Amino acid sequence: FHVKSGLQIKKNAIIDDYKVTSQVLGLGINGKVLQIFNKRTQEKFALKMLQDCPKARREVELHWRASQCPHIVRIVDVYENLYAGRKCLLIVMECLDGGELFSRIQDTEREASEIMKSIGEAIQYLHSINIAHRDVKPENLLYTSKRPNAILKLTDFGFAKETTSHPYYVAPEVLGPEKYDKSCDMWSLGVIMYILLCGYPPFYSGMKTRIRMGQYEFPNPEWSEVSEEVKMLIRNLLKTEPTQRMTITEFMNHPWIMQSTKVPQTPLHTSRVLKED
Numbered sequence: 133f134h135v136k137s138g139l140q141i142k143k144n145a146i147i148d149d150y151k152v153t154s155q156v157l158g159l160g161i162n163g164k165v166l167q168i169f170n171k172r173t174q175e176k177f178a179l180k181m182l183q184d185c186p187k188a189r190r191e192v193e194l195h196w197r198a199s200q201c202p203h204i205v206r207i208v209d210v211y212e213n214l215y216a217g218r219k220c221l222l223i224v225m226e227c228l229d230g231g232e233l234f235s236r237i238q239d240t241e242r243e244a245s246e247i248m249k250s251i252g253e254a255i256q257y258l259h260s261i262n263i264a265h266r267d268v269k270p271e272n273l274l275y276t277s278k279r280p281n282a283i284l285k286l287t288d289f290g291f292a293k294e295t296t297s298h299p300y301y302v303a304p305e306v307l308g309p310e311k312y313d314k315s316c317d318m319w320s321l322g323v324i325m326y327i328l329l330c331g332y333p334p335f336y337s338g339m340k341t342r343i344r345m346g347q348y349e350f351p352n353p354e355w356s357e358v359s360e361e362v363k364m365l366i367r368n369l370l371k372t373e374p375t376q377r378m379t380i381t382e383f384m385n386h387p388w389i390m391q392s393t394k395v396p397q398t399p400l401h402t403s404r405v406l407k408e409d
């Protein structure tokens with residue numbers, strides 16, 4: 133009987149259990165994400181502050197329900213305190229330090245693969261529980277440590293969304309209509325995989341067009357040493373039509389992804405280019 137705990141919105145002042153500092157781990161939509169310390173254990177953690185409101189509690193739940201996944205940043209616990217006469221939602225997160233995906237990179241095809249593989253997993257799990265991130269951009273991919281074995285994790289559920297309301301032989305369609313399709317998630321993947329391998333994004337900067345038109349290239353030299361197999365994989369991800377685009381399940385099985393170990397240590401110009409513009 134495997135069961136994890138349900139989420140609990142703590143009401144006591146976060147200050148008693150934690151020690152909040154002025155350091156800024158970073159900025160964004162909701163504001164500053166401060167670095168905090170756990171008194172009794174003295175470990176560092178990220179603190180996110182949301183206005184308490186229905187939409188917010190939904191996000192938090194989704195993320196908390198997905199923290200059981202290795203490659204998703206974990207929510208240690210959440211508070212509902214009173215901030216400025218305003219009822220807020222304080223979220224404590226494991227503190228990722230390694231830095232954003234591309235940074236670490238700039239600062240082998242096989243490595244690019246392995247990276248794609250973990251991002252894939254972050255998505256496979258979310259989807260396997262009916263959730264679409266819908267904001268899988270590089271920025272939201274931080275490394276745990278600076279160490280060489282740091283692990284990659286996806287974060288930010290400000291747009292996370294439930295795709296499911298309300299017979300061994302029945303088709304997935306019949307199971308019911310679930311919209312908000314995660315396809316974009318698979319698109320974000322292509323973009324990322326692209327950038328990794330060469331150092332720049334597929335669609336450059338009438339860009340909104342080149343996209344809708346779905347017109348890009350694997351410019352030489354950059355892609356001169358890249359397999360048509362790897363190339364073919366980007367294409368099925370970069371399909372302009374959702375329903376035509378590859379599935380997360382089909383991605384995790386594609387050879388390049390499923391067998392990183394056995395993938396060419398062919399160098400990539402990435403860092404260089406990545407640093408050039």
Ligand SMILES: Nc1ncnc2c1ncn2[C@@H]1O[C@H](COP(=O)(O)OP(=O)(O)O)[C@@H](O)[C@H]1O
Pocket residue numbers: 157158159160161162163165178205225226227228229271272274287288290
């Ligand atoms: N758990 C974390 N560990 C380390 N840094 C974080 C963490 N969460 C957020 N950050 C920093 O704060 C910024 C805000 O991140 P994000 O989760 O995307 O929230 P939002 O997009 O709503 O601003 C990130 O770009 C990052 O630099």
